RNA sequence: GCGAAGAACCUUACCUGGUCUUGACAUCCACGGAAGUUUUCAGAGAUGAGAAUGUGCCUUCGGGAACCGUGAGACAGGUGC
RNA sequence: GGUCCGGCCGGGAACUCAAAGGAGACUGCCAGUGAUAAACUGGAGGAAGGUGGGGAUGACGUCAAGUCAUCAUGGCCCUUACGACCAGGGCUACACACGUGCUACAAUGGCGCAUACAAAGAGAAGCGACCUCGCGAGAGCAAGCGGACCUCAUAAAGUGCGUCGUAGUCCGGAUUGGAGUCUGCAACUCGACUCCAUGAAGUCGGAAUCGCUAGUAAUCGUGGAUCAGAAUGCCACGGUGA
């Protein structure tokens, strides 16, 4: 219960156990199990050491938690730096890819404060 | 409805007539997967703003032919929601009839 | 072998001009199919009423395509040109196949 | 602004249609914009012929307009010229060929497009219109007509307030469908403005 | 969209009673038919009862 | 009780609103629970108009005033839906 | 409505078991216009109430219900100022329609993992006169017989049967 | 993310910048091509994308190759 | 012989062929369990088939089509009192009785324009 | 969720700039030219400059047509009130 | 009869169906009530019984309601500009307020596999099989069809099996990053969709308020117009069904 820096449920299936790591979900989490022979359906107590190991390099394949989250902050912080719309947007705290702002906008505004 | 809207339909009209139809070979056979993708594709997807561009089939706007309204129309009949209803109380659309069910 | 299909906007007059081919292809030869109905097609048009707002005052409408076979099973050669010289009732249409 | 057109309401049940062409949906249309234009200029220039109502019908790459007037004789002119010369204009703004026919109406006092025509240019050469609107109803019911009526609409005589006035007679029987009503609008272009005319005339059951 | 309730048989009677509990000591805006003016005047003598037996 | 202005023709200045606002406000508190007023303002080439609908536990009620001056107008319609509302009040009070 | 005793319409029985109460009470549940998976819960819930009671389920579920059909239900009215409830009887076609409800909604409160499980045991403590729907009865019951005092005018529930 | 083959430049924007490139750094280059991608071969320029009522110049740098030429000018204006 | 009843129900139309055989029912080649016998309401079938004796008497060869589940439930219905028609009204006499030869005439109603699915108006609310 | 039965350009009527004036659309007068077709330069394009190609319908023949340019206005035009 | 048991093939014109013509429902019959009247209540027969269900049909008028931006038109105003052409932008801005909807808050459910049943419609610079390539949106080749034939086009809810065990969860799918596809000169302002990742509010909504009487409400999918592309709207159609 500890894969790529993490990874700790039990008593839950594999595929759906292993989407607690920040860089996966259902389809690369099927593809792990896929491309190391595991069952998707065993739970993390079931798995023997000599699985899980061999999972952590599988893991370690795709971008994880803290590569992502810099990654991320680094593509943001990248357009912010050059200034263009989008990042001109993300300066500001409003929707980047041209939703409506008259009304709605309001999971990137936030709550309400008048 | 400003009759030089009206002239400027039926010029987008004549050059969309003219140009394309006859040079659509620019992107319909040049710019396709073959084994002539080199600087004659981009030869290609640069020549075509060399060309008017009201010449492209798609800066229609496919108006009334009686009063040249913008808005509601119907492309079976070529004319607007007002000018059908207009000729269809009269009689003049061959058939066609009020509809209950 | 002649397939004879012709379309209208109205039943009273389609029925009339099939009339106007059955006696022609059973005046001279033989061995026609019926007039053979089929489906109607019936182009619904919908449209908003006011030159304005008011949306919920609209009109429908409808136009009715009616369709009929004929089936010339032997064609003659005083059919074929029977079929010839004798297309009237405007207001069907008519198209032979072969 | 809240009836059924009378015409438009029984086109299957009771009256014929102006237009008997098949079109399929490729040229019906352009099938239908010709049919207009040639309906636009005779009604321009057949304009003293007194036409009641113009059928258009389209057999086999061609055309026939059938000239429905009460003044045929100056329809045709001398000899049968203008025939002709409507139907070259004719011919060039359709599908060429054209025959043009005449179905001349012999009551002209019972057709509501030369009535609403009659009133429209007496209110253009500036009768009173209780006089002219009332001398239809009136030429309508001593020859035949089972209802007949007329609404005149506007400004009329040069109000500043618009108005309308209508004198019907008899039956005009709107809501039944097998009920024969001849219904039809003209507009008179006065010097105070648009003065609209519309009437009803109703002959019959069946 | 259905027919009509109580056919102003025992519909007349609730007039009456009606009618009768809320003042109205006319007796006089029954009905004029016989079968039901007579329980017009019917609910309204049971009605003057049920007045008697409260305020 | 929030109240909604709209002007057809008519410029809405911030003064103006103030006090038709104010006014609307010293009714409402007078008179009863009001949810929520809207308020039209037309200018017709003479006629200074004005509507008003508030929307009350009760249902609708609406007035119009014409004017001369606008101000005039709005202070005709206040005046009406004061009246209106004490006959809706006591309408449902009833006891 | 004004008018209109109306032309009234029957239902279809119940398939596994001969009654039109069941379905009734599938029509009750039947949320969403979906008849099938409502069948398959009063399936699931009367064969743990079988399993659950010993007894037979027909039996089961009528014995269940009839400790939660009412007899006086309140119609709230008002006079001047008061706005007085007044006990009417029920008649006996609302009377077990009005506890199927009951049972209904208790069930759909009570919160257990499934469906049949809740109205199993919502049924279970209805035969026990212990659950949910039995409070409810017992509170109809205490204000129409508390408001007792009020057999009146014409408005409600003409001479008898 | 669109345009699957080739990038879009215009006529008189890649014949301008070949112009202009050969011909030494030189004054702003007022374009009306808004829709027209970067290409390498215009890093260093001060072309002045217009915008509506401005051309408003932006020196062309490394990481705007990508993006295009309306990218990197507003319209609209808030407060 | 060969009996048939037509019988058809809310846009869904059977055809019943009976015949004295034995308890067997067909519906479009495949059996009633595998068909909807186990589905919703299989009862509807079988129903007419109650009122009078089936046990062993006559089998049924079905071909319904159009519809849904219970549409072509309700067309067979129908469908299996119309071929109750060598078995005269001393059957369908006591067969007007329990319903079945109705034909049930309600079909869906048309949208109507304005409303939104012919009865729900788009909620002109105060809030 | 109204005209709008579907605003990237067009639509589009609004704005900033770049242009035209009997005009983008219609008629009347005169003068030239077949119309049309391929290509270049400049410009954001409109536009302006060109480069070649092209020539029957009736003999009245500077034409009768269709079509295109310039000129004078009568006008045209206006989704302006 | 034949059968690669596929209406597939000879064949048949019964049945579904197509759609032209007719019949049928009118208080026609019976019993009671009623002024012997109109009528009402109940019954029979019948597919339907009391204007059978639904639609179309909107009286005289009101609101000097809406439209001079569909059009037409009286008057007024501009006519080297309020007219005309082009590029770029804006109509998509956003402290906020209101209206109409879609998706949810889950176990009557989510997910995975298998599988059953519709009606209506559209299609020629259009609809686009089959077969290969691609995880997929889609791409290449390319038949067929101006269509009861060909295509859009796998209906979905449902059903059987398995799992999830009541948690912000295997609910919810917003937002944002990366990579693409298609359309069109051209997807930056501002298109749709796909894939990977991200995983917000939301645990059923105070005061106030709306629709709905039966194939209705409520849910589930499908099609059309407008359209190069762009429906959570509109207009239609069926399924389940109180």
């Known amino acids: 219960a500890r894969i790529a820096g993490i990874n700790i449920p039990d008593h839950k299936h594999a595929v759906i156990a292993l989407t607690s790591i920040y860089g996966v979900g259902k389809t690369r989490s099927k593809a792990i199990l896929a491309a190391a022979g595991i069952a998707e359906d065993v739970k993390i107590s079931e798995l023997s050491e000599g699985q899980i190991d061999t999972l952590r390099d599988e893991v370690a394949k795709f971008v994880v938690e803290g590569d992502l989250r810099r990654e991320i902050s680094m593509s943001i912080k990248r357009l912010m730096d050059l200034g263009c719309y989008r990042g001109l947007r993300h300066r500001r705290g409003l929707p980047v890819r041209g939703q409506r702002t008259k009304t709605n906008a309001r999971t990137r505004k936030g709550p309400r404060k008048p | 409805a400003k009759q030089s809207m009206k002239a400027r339909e039926v010029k987008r009209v004549a050059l969309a007539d003219k140009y394309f139809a006859k040079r659509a070979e620019l992107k319909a056979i040049i710019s396709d997967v073959n084994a002539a993708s080199d600087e004659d594709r981009w030869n290609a997807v640069l020549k075509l703003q060399t060309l008017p561009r009201d010449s492209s089939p798609s800066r229609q706007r496919n108006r009334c032919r009686q009063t040249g309204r913008p808005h509601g129309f119907l492309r079976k009949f070529g004319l607007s929601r007002i000018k059908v209803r207009e000729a269809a109380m009269r009689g003049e659309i061959p058939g066609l009839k009020k509809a209950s069910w | 072998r002649i397939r004879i299909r012709l379309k209208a906007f109205d039943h009273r007059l389609i029925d009339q001009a099939t009339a106007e081919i059955v006696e022609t292809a059973k005046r001279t030869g033989a061995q026609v199919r019926g007039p053979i109905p089929l489906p109607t097609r019936k182009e619904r048009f919908t449209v908003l009423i006011s030159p304005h707002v008011n949306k919920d005052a609209r009109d429908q409408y409808e136009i009715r395509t009616h369709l009929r076979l004929v089936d010339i099973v032997e064609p003659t050669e005083k059919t074929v040109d029977a079929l010839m010289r004798l297309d009237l009732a405007a207001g069907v249409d008519v198209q032979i196949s072969l | ?206 | 969209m259905k027919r009509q309730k109580r056919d102003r048989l025992e519909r007349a009677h609730q007039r009456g009673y009606q009618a009768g509990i809320a003042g109205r000591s006319k007796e006089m805006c029954p009905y004029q038919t016989l079968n039901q003016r007579s329980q017009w005047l019917g609910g309204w003598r049971e009605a003057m009862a049920d007045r008697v037996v409260m305020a | 009780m929030q109240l909604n202005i709209t002007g057809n023709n008519v410029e809405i200045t911030e003064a103006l609103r103030e006090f038709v606002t104010a006014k609307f406000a010293k009714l409402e508190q007078y008179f009863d629970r009001i949810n929520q007023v809207y308020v039209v303002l037309k200018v017709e080439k003479v006629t200074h108009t004005s509507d008003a609908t508030l929307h009350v536990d009760g249902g609708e009620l609406h007035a119009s005033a014409e004017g001369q001056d606008m101000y005039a107008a709005i202070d005709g319609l206040i005046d009406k839906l004061a009246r209106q509302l004490t006959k809706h009040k006591d309408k449902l009070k009833q006891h | 409505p004004r008018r209109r005793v109306i032309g009234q319409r029957k239902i279809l029985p119940d398939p596994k078991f001969g009654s039109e109460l069941l379905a009734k009470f599938v029509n009750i549940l039947m949320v969403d216009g979906k008849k099938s998976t409502a069948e398959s819960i009063v399936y699931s819930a009367l064969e743990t109430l079988a399993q659950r009671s010993g007894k037979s389920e027909l039996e089961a579920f009528e014995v269940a219900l009839e400790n939660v059909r009412p007899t006086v239900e309140v119609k709230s009215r008002r006079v001047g100022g008061s706005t007085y409830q007044v006990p009417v009887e029920v008649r006996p076609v609302r009377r077990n329609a009005l506890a199927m409800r009951w049972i209904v909604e208790a069930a759909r409160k009570r919160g257990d993992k499934s469906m049949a499980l809740r109205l199993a045991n919502e049924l279970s403590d209805a035969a026990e006169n212990k659950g949910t729907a039995v409070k409810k009865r017992e509170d109809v019951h205490r204000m129409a017989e508390a408001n007792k005092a009020f057999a009146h005018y014409a408005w409600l529930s003409l001479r008898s049967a | 993310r669109s345009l699957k083959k080739g990038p879009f430049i215009d006529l008189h924007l890649l014949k301008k910048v070949e112009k202009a490139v050969e011909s030494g750094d030189k004054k702003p280059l007022r374009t009306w091509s808004r829709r027209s991608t970067i290409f390498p071969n215009m890093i260093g320029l001060t072309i002045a994308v217009h915008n509506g009522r401005q051309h408003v110049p932006v020196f062309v740098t490394d990481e705007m190759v990508g993006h295009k030429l309306g990218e990197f000018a507003p319209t609209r204006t808030y407060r | 012989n060969q009996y048939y009843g037509t019988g058809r129900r809310k846009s869904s139309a059977a055809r019943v062929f009976i015949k004295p055989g034995n308890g067997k029912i067909v519906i479009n080649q495949r059996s009633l369990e595998q068909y909807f016998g186990r589905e919703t309401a299989r009862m509807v079938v079988r129903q007419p088939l109650e009122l009078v004796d089936m046990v062993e008497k006559l089998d049924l060869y079905i071909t319904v089509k159009g519809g849904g589940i219970s549409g072509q439930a309700g067309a067979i219905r129908h469908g299996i009192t119309r071929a109750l028609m060598e078995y005269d009204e001393s059957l369908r006499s006591e067969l007007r009785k329990a319903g079945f030869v109705t034909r049930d005439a309600r079909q869906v109603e048309r949208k109507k324009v304005g409303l939104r699915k012919a009865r729900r108006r788009p909620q002109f609310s105060k809030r």
């Open chain 4, 1 to 206: 602004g809240q009836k059924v057109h009378p015409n438009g309401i029984r086109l299957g049940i009771v009256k014929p249609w102006n237009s008997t062409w098949f079109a399929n949906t490729k040229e019906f249309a352009d099938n239908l914009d010709s049919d207009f234009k040639v309906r636009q200029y005779l009604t321009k220039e057949l304009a003293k012929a007194s036409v009641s109502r113009i059928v258009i019908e389209r057999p086999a790459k061609s055309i026939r307009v059938t000239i429905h007037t009460a003044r045929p004789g100056i329809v045709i002119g001398k000899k049968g010229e203008d025939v002709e010369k409507l139907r070259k204009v004719v011919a060039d703004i359709a599908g060429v060929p054209a025959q043009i026919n005449i179905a001349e109406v012999r009551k002209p006092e019972l057709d509501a497009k030369l009535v609403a025509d009659s009133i429209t240019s007496q209110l253009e050469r500036r009768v009173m219109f209780r006089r002219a609107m009332k001398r239809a109803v009136q030429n309508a019911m001593r020859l035949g007509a089972k209802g007949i009526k007329v609404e005149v609409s506007g400004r009329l005589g040069g109000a500043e307030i618009a108005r309308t006035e209508w004198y019907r007679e008899g039956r005009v029987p709107l809501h039944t469908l097998r009920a024969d009503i001849d219904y039809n609008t003209s507009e008179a272009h006065t010097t105070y403005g648009v003065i609209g005319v519309k009437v009803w005339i109703f002959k019959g059951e069946i």
